C-alpha cells in the first residue's frame, strides 16, 4: 500500500494578555504518532504511538525546539491576519496548517503538501509542482507576493522532498507491522417493521479498522441509493469503527434485498441478507 506523513497544526487565539494556544499533531499512515500542545504543564513533543519510544532524548529536544519556533511563527502570522482582514480585537480566530508527504507502495515520493487556513477557510497552498502558490482570498495574494520574493517554496520543497521522506522511511520501518493492522467488519441486518406494510432493513458493520468502509443495498442486482439512509462512520472508542446503512422495503420481501460490505481487511466483500 501507499504511505503518508502529516503534521496538522493549529493556533487559536484568545482576547487578552495571553498568547494563542498552539497544537501540533503528527500522523504516519493516518495515525497520530506525536503531539505537541502549548497548554500542557510542560510543553513538549510526546509519543502517541509505542514505536516512537525508540526515539532518543535528542530527537524529542530537537522537535520541541522546532515546535516553539512554529508557536512564535503562528502568533506573528495571527497578528498579520488580523490586519489583512480588518478584524478588530476580541474575536476568536484560528489559523491552521497541514504539511506532509505522500509515498507510493514503492516508498517513493508521490506528492508534497503545504496548506494554510484562516477561520477554517482555505488561505494559501503550495502547488503540487512545489514552486508556486494558489492564494484564495485577496488578503492571501499579499502573502503570496511576499512569499515569492522570499523564496518560501524553495524552502518547503527542500523539506518536503528531503526530510519528510527520509524521516517517514524511518518511522515506516519502526512502526512496521503496527501501522498495517486491519480489523475486518462484522455485519448483521436488523429488521424494523414499520407502518404501511413495510420494514426498515438496517445493515451494521462493527469493529473494523481502518475507518474506510462502504455499505450498499441491492435490489435485484442494482445498487439502491433511493431512500437509503446511513450514518457517518464513528469510532467505538476501542480503536475500531462502526457504520450502518438502511433501506425501507416491503415486509415479507426481505430476501429480495441484499447488503454488501466493502472493506480492505476482507478477503472479499461481505454479502448478507436479513436472517430470521
Amino acid at each position: 500500500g501507499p504511505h503518508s506523513m502529516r503534521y496538522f497544526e493549529t493556533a487559536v487565539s484568545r482576547p487578552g494578555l495571553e498568547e494563542p494556544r498552539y497544537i501540533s499533531v503528527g500522523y504516519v499512515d493516518n495515525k497520530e504518532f506525536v503531539r505537541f500542545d502549548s497548554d500542557a504543564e510542560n510543553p513538549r513533543y510526546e509519543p502517541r504511538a509505542p514505536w516512537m519510544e525508540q526515539e532518543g532524548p535528542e530527537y524529542w529536544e530537537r522537535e520541541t525546539q522546532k515546535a516553539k519556533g512554529q508557536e512564535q511563527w503562528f502568533r506573528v502570522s495571527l497578528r498579520n491576519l488580523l490586519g489583512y482582514y480588518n478584524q478588530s480585537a476580541g474575536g476568536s480566530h484560528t489559523l491552521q496548517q497541514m504539511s506532509g508527504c505522500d509515498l507510493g507502495s514503492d516508498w517513493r515520493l508521490l506528492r508534497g503538501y503545504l496548506q494554510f487556513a484562516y477561520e477554517g477557510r482555505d488561505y494559501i497552498a503550495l502547488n503540487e509542482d512545489l514552486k508556486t502558490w494558489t492564494a484564495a482570498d485577496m488578503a492571501a495574494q499579499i502573502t503570496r507576493r511576499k512569499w515569492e520574493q522570499s523564496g518560501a517554496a524553495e524552502h518547503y520543497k527542500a523539506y518536503l522532498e528531503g526530510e519528510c521522506v527520509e524521516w517517514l522511511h524511518r518511522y515506516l520501518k519502526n512502526g512496521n507491522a503496527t501501522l498495517l493492522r486491519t480489523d475486518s467488519p462484522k455485519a448483521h441486518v436488523t429488521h424494523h417493521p414499520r407502518s404501511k406494510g413495510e420494514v426498515t432493513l438496517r445493515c451494521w458493520a462493527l469493529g473494523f479498522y481502518p475507518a474506510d468502509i462502504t455499505l450498499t443495498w441491492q435490489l435485484n442486482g442494482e445498487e439502491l441509493t433511493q431512500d437509503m439512509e446511513l450514518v457517518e462512520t464513528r469510532p467505538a472508542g476501542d480503536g475500531t469503527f462502526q457504520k450502518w446503512a438502511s433501506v425501507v422495503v416491503p415486509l415479507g420481501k426481505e430476501q429480495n434485498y441484499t447488503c454488501r460490505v466493502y472493506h480492505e481487511g476482507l478477503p472479499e466483500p461481505l454479502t448478507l441478507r436479513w436472517e430470521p
Binding site: 515546535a67 519556533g69 512554529q70 502570522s77 498579520n80 512569499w147 522570499s150
Partner: peptide, 10 residues
C-alpha cells in the same frame, strides 16, 4: 519530523 516555517510569515 515536523515543519519549520522559518522567516516567511503570513
Amino acid at each position: 519530523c515536523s515543519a519549520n516555517n522559518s522567516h516567511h510569515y503570513i
